[PDB]
Design a protein around this ligand. Structure first.
Ligand SMILES: Cn1c(=O)c2c(ncn2CC(=O)Nc2ccc(-c3ccccc3)nn2)n(C)c1=O
Ligand SMILES: [Zn+2]
Length: 431
């Protein structure tokens, strides 16, 4: 019952989960701290890149054993492709083709499934970094093609190698140049670590047992769906905050604004997903570095196909980056339709009603007549409840191929797809 559960909660799932989660990240945090301290010694830049290459090798070996060879071969192949087309204006195109072949080949089961699934996050960060550097060289954001040691240090940046957020090559070079260790930096690292541990504890203990104990038929199914979604969300938040901690602790994730340093790297915004304004905001706030990467390097390059086709291409690239599994592929394919339909419907509603009911908050200078009214707040609350409903529906899959997805979405009576279809019908009608 609830009494015995709360009698055994502390020694049962708080301390065990916390100890386990801490004991499998402490060496990575130590290597990130060593990289931060070593990069403040005034060493030459190539020595810093070689040191983080060695640290990335040791971190990849520590987390993925001998299997790390696939990430190593991906990094070597990416540098080979970048060097072969170093004088072309389509470096991002060639690198994206290389990545596509590599990742697909991996999905084709040429490599062991448990192996592919184990280190896919690191192969994703390496692929994102390589494609981003190729497109930045194409667009002129990066002036010259990097030397081998700089490229390999960028791929094996120890704050970003394991669970790290994608960072740009310029952001990596700024981390290499170094910044003074300050109280603000340490507070950022500590806050990120504390939030990570809290999210992990919530994901493992509070999340799955939320409704039977913590909180006092179709409703039951939706409650189970919601708690599976919220637990999956806190697992993602744990990874996000841990990635913030590692990246900041290695010396990255700062913004030199108006000659004022702000360690403000944000990977995930839990409040914007748990309390959502729109599903577009949810998708963006899920993994901000990933959302930026996909917008800047997939969405803008696919704009020649139209807006909707570019959205589908971006979500398919998201599928490719996170691994092709029917549940996640179905979730991302549904997310494309959900975000597109809700975005265009909220734009049309905002235009017709002259209201601040867009998928994001309006700027302080916007032409909408109704900005803070009761109807605007009611419509925004209705769309936020629809976003929570979509989150519970899509997150029910993450408590497993076609049959599991069909069964889990039939227990919810395919409600979110009907709501998305109904919202699209409403969109067309008002227009
Ligand atoms: C809610 N949610 C996710 O956001 C998610 C997830 N799995 C991975 N993501 C992250 C993700 O793919 N983010 C994306 C996807 C597309 C775009 C994009 C599209 C069009 C234009 C510009 C950018 N931006 N970010 N799951 C299970 C989930 O429920
Ligand atoms: Zn407005």
């Amino acid at each position: 019952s609830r009494q015995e559960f709360f009698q055994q909660l502390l020694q049962g799932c708080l301390l065990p989960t916390a100890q386990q989660g801490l004991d499998q990240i402490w060496l990575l945090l130590a290597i990130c701290l060593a990289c931060r301290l070593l990069w403040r010694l005034g060493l030459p830049s190539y020595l810093k890149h070689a040191s983080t290459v060695a640290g990335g090798f040791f971190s990849l070996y520590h987390f993925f054993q001998l299997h790390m060879v696939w990430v190593v071969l991906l990094s070597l192949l990416c540098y080979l492709v970048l060097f072969l087309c170093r004088h072309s204006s389509h470096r991002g195109v060639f690198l994206s083709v290389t990545i596509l072949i590599y990742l697909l080949m991996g999905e084709m089961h040429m490599v062991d499934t448990v192996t592919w699934h184990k280190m896919r996050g690191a192969q994703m960060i390496v692929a994102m970094k390589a494609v981003s550097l190729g497109f930045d060289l194409d667009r002129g954001e990066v002036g010259t093609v990097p030397s081998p040691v700089e490229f390999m240090g960028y791929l094996y940046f120890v704050g970003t190698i394991v669970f790290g957020p994608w960072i740009s090559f310029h952001s990596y070079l700024q981390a290499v140049q170094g910044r003074p260790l300050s109280a603000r930096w340490l507070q950022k690292v500590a806050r990120s670590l504390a939030l990570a541990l809290l999210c992990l504890v919530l994901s493992t203990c509070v999340g799955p047992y939320l409704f039977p104990y913590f909180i006092p038929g179709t409703m039951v199914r939706w409650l189970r769906a919601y708690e599976s979604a919220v637990s999956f969300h806190f697992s993602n938040y744990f990874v996000g905050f841990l990635s913030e901690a590692t990246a900041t602790l290695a010396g990255a994730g700062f913004t030199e604004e108006k000659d004022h340093l702000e360690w403000d790297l944000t990977v995930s915004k839990p409040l914007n997903v748990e309390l959502p304004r729109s599903m577009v905001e949810v998708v963006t706030s899920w993994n901000l570095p990933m959302s930026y990467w996909l917008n800047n390097y997939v969405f803008k390059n696919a704009l020649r196909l139209g807006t909707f086709s570019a959205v589908l291409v971006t979500y398919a690239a998201s599928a490719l980056l996170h691994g092709f599994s029917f549940h996640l592929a179905a979730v991302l394919l549904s997310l494309a339709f959900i975000t597109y339909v809700e975005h265009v419907l909220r734009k049309r509603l905002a235009r017709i009603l002259s209201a601040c009911v867009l998928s994001k908050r309006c700027p302080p200078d916007c032409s909408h007549q109704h900005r803070l009214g009761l109807g605007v707040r009611a419509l925004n609350l209705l769309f936020g409840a629809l976003a929570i409903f979509h989150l519970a529906y899509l997150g029910s899959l993450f408590d497993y191929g076609m049959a599991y997805t069909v069964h889990k979405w039939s227990e919810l009576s395919w409600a979110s797809h009907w709501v998305t279809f109904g919202c699209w019908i409403f969109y067309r009608l008002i227009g």
